[PDB]
């Protein structure tokens, strides 16, 4: 009522609380480490027109080992804040690796355009994941010029997201056909990067790795360094199931999920059932707050005594005082 005096009558109050007073963490018991060495320390990186793709599964994504001997000049993430990366699980983990020119590093982003973005490598508008790029002038360049890295210069259209084309047909610019030979208005679509140690900072080679993952919708095999905890049933607890944070009471369920299903949802999109990452059992989750409360009082000018009415509950079942 936002007043210091209350008149005679009945009033409504907030819902009953039912505090959980317990935190439970359930994660898959993965003990191996992610491919940090043989991916970031790869001696040879594929060219941009033939960017390399790799699949990662069944590992613990602990990046804390990268501080000792790695330094990245460009780091960005879309769809997830970096600070939460330690408390999440990733369903499908893909890594794309290539080497480009420095000034083109900004071209790897959703909605971008240019040479690399249109003819070599493109990202979807709804892309989620992270992009990492670092200078490699002292590793990829050499005296006299390194010409082992190539890119595409001419194409008849724009690439679709995550599209790779390695055709080396002679590009035709004029009306006359190019009968497999160079000539006027006839070109070879591929060109070579002229990496040299003495080149400017914009012309130095840069190594780029793009990580793609999807969150909280499918069973996951790559998780962070979080540690699991024993399961509690018939009790209200805080739970963190494979990166999903929630609060409620866990019970066993008669529901039978399909093998590819992980979560069950109600009409209001709230999580209703979940498969345990370790015991593969099905558990129903129910909210804790329940039962309206009413305060019955005469005028505060008369007396301070009040009565409490809890709705839609017994007195025998308690949670009443």
């Amino acid at each position: 009522l936002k007043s210091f005096t209350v008149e005679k009558g009945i009033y409504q109050t907030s819902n009953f609380r039912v505090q959980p007073t317990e935190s439970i963490v359930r994660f898959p018991n993965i003990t191996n480490l992610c491919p940090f060495g043989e991916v970031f320390n790869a001696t040879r990186f594929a060219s941009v027109y033939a960017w390399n793709r790799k699949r990662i599964s069944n590992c613990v994504a602990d990046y804390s080992v990268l501080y000792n001997s790695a330094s990245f000049s460009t780091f960005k993430c879309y769809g997830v804040s970096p600070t939460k990366l330690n408390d999440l699980c990733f369903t499908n983990v893909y890594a794309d690796s290539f080497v480009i020119r420095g000034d083109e590093v900004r071209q790897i982003a959703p909605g971008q355009t240019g040479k690399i973005a249109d003819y070599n490598y493109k990202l979807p508008d709804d892309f989620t994941g992270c992009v990492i790029a670092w200078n490699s002038n002292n590793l990829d360049s050499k005296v006299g010029g390194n010409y082992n890295y190539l890119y595409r210069l001419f194409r008849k259209s724009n690439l679709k997201p995550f599209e790779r084309d390695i055709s080396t047909e002679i590009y035709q610019a004029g009306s006359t056909p190019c009968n497999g030979v160079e000539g006027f208005n006839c070109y070879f679509p591929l060109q070579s990067y002229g990496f040299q140690p003495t080149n400017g900072v914009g012309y130095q080679p840069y190594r780029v790795v793009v990580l793609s993952f999807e969150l909280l919708h499918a069973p996951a095999t790559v998780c962070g360094p979080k540690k699991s905890t024993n399961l509690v049933k018939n009790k209200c607890v805080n739970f963190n199931f494979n990166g999903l944070t929630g609060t409620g009471v866990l019970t066993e369920s008669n529901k039978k999920f399909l093998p590819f299903q992980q979560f069950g949802r109600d009409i209001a999109d709230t999580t209703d059932a979940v498969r345990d990452p370790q015991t593969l059992e099905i558990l129903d989750i129910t909210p804790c707050s329940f039962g309206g409360v009413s305060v019955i009082t005469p005028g505060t000018n008369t007396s301070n005594q009040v009565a409490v009415l809890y709705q839609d509950v017994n007195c025998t079942e308690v949670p009443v005082a």
Binding site: R53, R55, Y94, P124, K160, P161, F162, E163, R164, D165, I166, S167, E169, H217, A218, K255, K256, F257, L258, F260, Q261, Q262, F263, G264, R265, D266, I267, A273
Partner: protein, 241 residues
């Protein structure tokens, strides 16, 4: 090596598959996705009458096959079907399933010879293989497949059921399930099927998916039992509304 060697049907409410990997029960849900329209115009081929022509791949393909002794063996996807462009091959060679993404030089008339498996006149040469997967070695049947190509990913949905009738597509509800998702990342505009030539007695049907809004009714147990297409007829529009 290599060597050189219409019928229409109604789509009896077929083309429904699980849209996403969650669990729902006793809830009617609306989805907006690529589906095969109800009572569509699906093309019908025989191998008993022996054809396997190059069919366009517009936006997604529903492929059904009624067979007894495994006439259908696989598919070939690509935009030119020669060594100039990368192409995808899925094959079942009676002991393993092989999925490859290579610049194959496919033969003019690909086939697999059965006397056992004695001929492999599929492609003249293979090179530049950026992706390869093989599994562990190992009218009475109807198999339904749904192929989609979205942002480089290739999605395959599969279902199978015993059917004993002779000619037509059986009428009845069928819900496909998510089978495979592959990061091929190639251009696909044409596709061709692979037949097992014996030295056949089967038939198959091909149809094209289109963007549609579907209302799916979920059973008490974890499955779908009925679907409504919001553009088939005005009554379906009223039902969706």
């Amino acid at each position: 090596q290599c060597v050189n060697l219409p019928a229409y049907t109604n789509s009896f409410t077929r083309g429904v598959y699980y849209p996403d990997k969650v669990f729902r029960s006793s809830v009617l849900h609306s989805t907006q996705d690529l589906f095969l329209p109800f009572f569509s115009n699906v093309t019908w081929f025989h191998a008993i009458r022996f054809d396997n022509p190059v069919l366009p791949f517009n936006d997604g393909v529903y492929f059904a096959s009624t067979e007894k002794s495994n006439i259908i063996r696989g598919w070939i996807f690509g935009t030119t079907l020669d060594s100039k462009t990368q192409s995808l091959l899925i094959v079942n060679n009676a002991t393993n399933v092989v999925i490859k993404v290579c610049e194959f030089q496919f033969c003019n008339d690909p086939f697999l010879g059965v006397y056992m498996e004695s001929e492999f006149r599929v492609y003249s040469s293979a090179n530049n293989c950026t992706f390869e997967y093989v599994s562990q070695p190992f009218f009475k049947n109807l198999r339904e497949f749904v192929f989609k190509n979205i942002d480089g990913y290739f999605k395959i949905y599969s279902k199978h059921t015993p059917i004993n009738l002779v000619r037509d597509l059986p009428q009845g509800f069928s819900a496909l399930e998510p089978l495979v998702d592959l990061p091929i990342g190639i251009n696909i505009t044409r596709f061709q099927t692979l037949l097992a030539l014996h030295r056949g007695a089967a038939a198959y049907y091909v149809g094209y998916l289109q963007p549609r809004t579907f209302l799916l009714k979920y059973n008490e147990n974890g499955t779908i039992t009925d679907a409504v297409d919001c553009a088939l007829d005005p009554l379906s529009e009223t039902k969706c509304t």
